Design an enzyme around this catalytic site. Structure first.
Site, PDB file in Angstrom:
ATOM      1  CG  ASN F  78      46.176  28.951  48.403  1.00  0.00           C
ATOM      2  OD1 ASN F  78      46.240  30.002  49.040  1.00  0.00           O
ATOM      3  ND2 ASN F  78      46.883  27.874  48.725  1.00  0.00           N
ATOM      4  CB  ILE F  85      39.563  26.572  44.466  1.00  0.00           C
ATOM      5  CG1 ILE F  85      39.130  27.505  43.334  1.00  0.00           C
ATOM      6  CG2 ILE F  85      39.828  27.356  45.739  1.00  0.00           C
ATOM      7  CD1 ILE F  85      37.770  28.127  43.547  1.00  0.00           C
ATOM      8  CB  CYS F  86      44.103  23.659  46.728  1.00  0.00           C
ATOM      9  SG  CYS F  86      44.771  22.558  47.996  1.00  0.00           S
ATOM     10  CG  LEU F  87      39.461  26.853  51.406  1.00  0.00           C
ATOM     11  CD1 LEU F  87      38.961  28.231  51.021  1.00  0.00           C
ATOM     12  CD2 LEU F  87      38.425  26.169  52.245  1.00  0.00           C
TER      13      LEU F  87
END
Ligand SMILES: [Zn+2]
Ligand SMILES: [Zn+2]
Lengths: 109, 83, 76, 85, 99, 148, 93, 99, 82, 108, 94
Positions: F78, F85-87
């Site tokens: 991720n 960051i892909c959250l």
DNA sequence: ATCGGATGTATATATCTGACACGTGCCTGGAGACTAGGGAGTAATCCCCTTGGCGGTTAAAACGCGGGGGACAGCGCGTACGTGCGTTTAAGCGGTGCTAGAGCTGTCTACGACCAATTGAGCGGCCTCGGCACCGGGATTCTCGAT
DNA sequence: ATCGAGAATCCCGGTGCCGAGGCCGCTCAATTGGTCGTAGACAGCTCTAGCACCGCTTAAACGCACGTACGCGCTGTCCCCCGCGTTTTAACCGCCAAGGGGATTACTCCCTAGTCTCCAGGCACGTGTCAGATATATACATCCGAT
């Protein structure tokens, strides 16, 4: 036909055909426009214009005039049945209204 | 240059005249206020769309074409002012 | 043997390599020195994309040959 | 009774309530923060994450967003806090 | 001794005269002032072309004439000759303007 | 402006009771820029991992989310190479009520276990879902040569 | 200045063809222009919708014919279709 | 001796019942046969998808419900409770369907 | 072939529609007028539906044609396509 | 916003920006389509759909049912002034009608 | 197999789950919502295309969509839709 | 059923004025010839779904009867609106002045169309379990004749 | 003002079934990267008409008074929908069976878009003159009080 004269004269129509073709091209109606559509459309437009003009001229002659004013157009459109349905929602400037009085409001005999 | 209560400019004889054209013989005494209210509502409805049309084009003068086009959108097509 | 490369950042990194080496190994060397993974690296030799399976000698990389680099940027 | 001074402050701006708005999910926040959120946030209550859009549409026409009784209580009981705003 | 018409014939004469003419039935300046008031209520510092005012007046007059025709039909349906506000309200309700 | 006071309370909250394995502070005079350090959690393949990251505060906070970036190198499905960051909470599930401690602990939770539904890098994603041991040892030779 | 197109001369020609004696004022001329534009836009829009409805990408004569049959009332529709097909047949040869 | 409801308290019960449910009111096969008759009047040897017949029935039911609502409103306006054909004609004339 | 089938719209089948509409009392002549107006409305819709079907060189009146005709008439219908 | 992610999530929407863009471009509306139009249009459509669905779900919950059916859609649409104004001429299949009895017809 | 038919079903379901976390929706309601979305899309796109043709422009910019939304929707839905569209465009561009 | 005023409307004649019909310059849009490629016409095949038919059972329709409530006609009251006259108000017309804003032209820079490789979002098909439909019994609540 | 019997409607508990929600395989449409022609954004200039003001008519608006005719409430009559019981009719469901035509695929050819060149049809501008509006003076249709 002869394929030598102007397009409008070739089809026997007085309405322009090239202008209708350009309007169809630039009108964002379809990606492609056939070669017979403008002729058909111009014929329909010319027929409708001729019919309305004939009725308006009849009304103007009835009213003893040599010019067609908006009142004559209003009378010609409303008195007919088909044209009135076609132009039901259309409002004509300087048109007035057809003379009609309900029978109840008239004086008794 | 503000304006107030200009709706009184549509006087009683004017509404009487309009009803006479419509085909009305006898008119009550409370028709005039209702007619003024209806006319005001219709003007607001048309003028809002006209002003939106003239504001999208980045202008300051409302054009007769804008009024014609707002009327056509609202469902009352008008003939005699271009288009 | 040093190679001049016009990367995306434009920096040319001095490193002694040989044309006989494979593309995977030189990509691993770059990852050791620059950190770019072999998949992210894309060497450009006169506008031609080089496959990782082949070597440098196949496209005739010579002494200080002016090359290019583009990073395979997926995400971020 | 009387609400505590600390509990009354807005949960967004960490400062007293001005023109408080009572959400249908009985969450209270000050009008500046609520307006900024409806302008920029996701049109949801920040805490419980439920939409208020229909409620906002209904209440904005009649101008009933502000809680009159809580505003009166906060201004009468704590005038100096409103003055320092 | 003075001759006065029976109550009602003058109205019929006016109806006959007014359904034959085509001019506008509202004074120009009051209507222009009213439309300017509404416009400046919407957006301040606006200017109007004369043709726009004329078109607005024509549209409003035609709409009012149609509404009065429908109101007269309702009033006659109610076994009456006078038109009352409930006739106008019913006509607007049937037409779907107010639903 | 108004966000400066919110940053003040957030700094105070971090100061009184700092969380476990994470610590943040401003590098310079401006309170908009922040940097933080994170430890590798025990129940994770990142034992003994030290990581640094940077925090950017937009002028309209908390009404808009802050920006995060890993200045160090880390292997994870991720997170990209550059540190993006892909959250969900960073751009899609951000609310003004959240705090910097909350996003830091959410990042730590992601480092505890990855999210495979929305991989930022798909190659290491299929590597991880292929088998656990490959992810194990790749995380090994990534964390003991980059973090330490 | 800028040239503004209109259907003026053609409508005048049709009027002279029908009534050689009667004239026409300016207001009636603008009304006729607006009417022609309205009918043109209606038929063109209906034809475009019909072409898009059948996963096509061109407007042939038959789409215009079907649009006319849809829009105009009965007798007017029949007369317009007859006139249009006559004009197309005379044009194609 | 037998218990009979007064005239008026049963119709209101039907009004309350039918305004809560949503099923179709007209029978299926007679409506389908009528639609097929009209279609064969227009063009011979046609076929109908069941979805088309259902759509036609839904549209007709909605239109008739609206027309009866307007008719009832006109009848109440005329100081009555019964709906009469002149009410239907007036509602249609005002709505512009026949003018 | 079929003939004299407008009688299929039965008297209870019109009483029920009136009951849904909000009608408490019904006169004895409403049924004929209702049948007439229903026939007119059906004819108006079905003409456009059949024209749409005939344009596509088809022989079955699909639901899409009816939906398009209703939309053209100003009575947009939801559920059957579009 | 940072690039290199799916278009529909860059703006935070749920409706497909790409599908809307393709429909606008090939739908024969204009010669050229700007790059910001699909995002705005998708946002408007999503907003309206959420508005309809929230009220429909509220009506369904009030009806002791955990599933939205067309009757709930009709009840939600016709009970809101703005939505009823917007969907004036539209007919919802299997939607019924609102309960309404004129006061004159009630027994005295 | 049958050729692919596109619809707004999955997105409407996602929005519904975003609004009501534990409420299902039938098939007929899905069809109705799909038709509603298509109808509103057609209305707005057609009005925007006209308005672009009105001023001799050639591009349907977000300004035209905003004006079409202001025209078609009623009073309050206009303001809320305009705010949502501006928010979406602003978040997308940066 | 008229008949007289008395009023308004319709009809015949001079005149004069500004809008309509026509003439001319020219320039921009339409016509003519040629080329390329994809859209549509046509033939063939598959299988989905529309039409047709039978038997049963039963919910809905058809018919009849008693009666009560509602539609409709006739009368009387008085109040609100029609008609006419004198008075006050501001619409309508002309003439002049000013400038804000519509409209057109020239530069050019950045936004959007086109094309190719690629891969993951979304669609079709399967499967299952829970939400809703249904049945049966009981509690609750309007309704009406009788006090 | 009420009490109570008969009847319709709502609640609650148990059983069952089918369709809505999730999963798996896969194909094609959206993504990304790069290039290029032109659309409109902006600055500048012109000049049209929208706005403001002033004075003079006189036409429409206004207020008041009188009277009458129509809206409205009331009463009475009668007849026609309504509610209920009984009988007849066909709608609805499940079932089977045949084939018509909708839907997809492959192939080919010819119809239209795009480009260049050229020229004349229609538009803007200017000018003459007569169709219609206006003023003025009779002729007649119509209305209202009175026999
Ligand atoms: Zn706050
Ligand atoms: Zn909340």
């Amino acid at each position: 036909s002869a394929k030598a004269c102007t397009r409008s004269s070739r089809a026997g129509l007085q309405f322009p055909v090239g202008r209708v073709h350009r309007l169809l091209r630039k009108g964002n109606y379809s990606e492609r426009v056939g070669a017979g559509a403008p002729v058909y459309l111009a014929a329909v437009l010319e027929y409708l214009t001729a019919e309305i003009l004939e009725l308006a001229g009849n009304a103007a002659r009835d009213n003893k005039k040599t010019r067609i004013i908006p009142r004559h157009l209003q009378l010609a459109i409303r008195n007919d049945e088909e044209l009135n349905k076609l132009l039901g929602r259309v409002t004509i400037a300087q048109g007035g209204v057809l003379p009609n009085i309900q029978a109840v409001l008239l004086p008794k005999k | 240059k503000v304006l107030r209560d200009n709706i009184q400019g549509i006087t009683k004889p004017a509404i009487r005249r309009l009803a006479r054209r419509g085909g009305v013989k006898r008119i009550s005494g409370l028709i005039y206020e209702e007619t003024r209210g209806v006319l005001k509502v219709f003007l607001e409805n048309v003028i809002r769309d006209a002003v939106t049309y003239t504001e999208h084009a980045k202008r300051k003068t409302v054009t007769a074409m804008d009024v014609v086009y707002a009327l056509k959108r609202q469902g009352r097509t008008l003939y005699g002012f271009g288009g | 043997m040093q190679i001049f490369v016009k990367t995306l950042t434009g920096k040319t990194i001095t490193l002694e390599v040989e044309p006989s080496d494979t593309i995977e190994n030189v990509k691993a060397k770059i990852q050791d020195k620059e950190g770019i993974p072999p998949d992210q690296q894309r060497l450009i030799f006169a506008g031609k994309q080089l496959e990782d399976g082949r070597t440098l000698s196949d496209y005739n990389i010579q002494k200080e040959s002016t090359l290019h680099l583009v990073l395979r940027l997926r995400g971020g | 009774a009387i609400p505590s001074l600390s509990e009354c402050q807005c949960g967004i701006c960490m400062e007293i309530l001005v023109e408080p708005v009572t959400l249908p999910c009985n969450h209270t926040l000050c009008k500046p923060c609520f307006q900024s959120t409806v302008e920029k946030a996701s049109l949801c209550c920040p805490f419980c994450r439920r939409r208020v859009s229909s409620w906002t549409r209904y209440h904005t026409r009649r101008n009933s967003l502000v809680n009159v009784e809580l505003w009166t209580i906060i201004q009468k009981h704590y005038p100096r806090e409103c003055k320092l705003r | 001794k003075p001759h006065r018409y029976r109550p009602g014939t003058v109205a019929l004469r006016e109806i006959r005269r007014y359904q034959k003419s085509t001019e506008l039935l509202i004074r120009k300046l009051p209507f222009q002032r009213l439309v300017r008031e509404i416009a400046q209520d919407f957006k301040t510092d606006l200017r109007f072309q004369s043709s726009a005012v004329m078109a607005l007046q024509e549209a409003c007059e035609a709409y009012l004439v149609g509404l009065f025709e429908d109101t007269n039909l309702c009033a006659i349906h109610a076994k009456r000759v006078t038109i009352m506000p409930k006739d106008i309200q019913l006509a607007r309700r049937i037409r779907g303007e107010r639903a | 402006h108004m966000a400066l006071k919110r940053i003040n309370k957030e700094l105070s909250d971090l100061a009184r009771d700092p969380p476990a394995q994470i610590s943040a502070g401003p590098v310079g005079d401006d309170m908009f820029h922040w940097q933080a350090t994170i430890m590798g959690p025990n129940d994770s393949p990142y034992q003994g991992g030290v990581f640094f990251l940077t925090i950017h505060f937009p002028t309209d906070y908390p009404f808009k989310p802050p920006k995060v970036a890993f200045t160090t190198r880390i292997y994870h499905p991720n997170i990209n190479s550059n540190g993006s960051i892909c959250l969900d909470i960073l751009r899609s599930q951000w609310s003004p009520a959240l705090t910097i401690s909350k996003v830091l602990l959410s990042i730590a939770s992601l480092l505890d276990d990855p999210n495979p539904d929305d991989p930022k890098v798909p190659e290491i994603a299929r590597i991880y879902k292929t088998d656990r041991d490959k992810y194990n040892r790749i995380s090994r030779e990534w964390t003991q040569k980059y973090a330490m | 200045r800028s040239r503004k197109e209109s259907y003026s001369i053609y409508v005048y020609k049709v009027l002279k063809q029908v009534h050689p004696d009667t004239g026409i004022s300016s207001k009636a001329m603008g009304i006729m222009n607006s009417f022609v534009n309205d009918i043109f836009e209606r038929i063109a829009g209906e034809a475009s919708r019909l072409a898009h409805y059948n996963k096509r990408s061109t407007i042939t004569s038959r789409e215009i014919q079907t649009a006319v049959r849809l829009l105009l009332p009965g007798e007017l529709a029949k007369h317009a279709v007859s006139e249009g097909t006559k004009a197309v047949t005379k044009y194609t040869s």
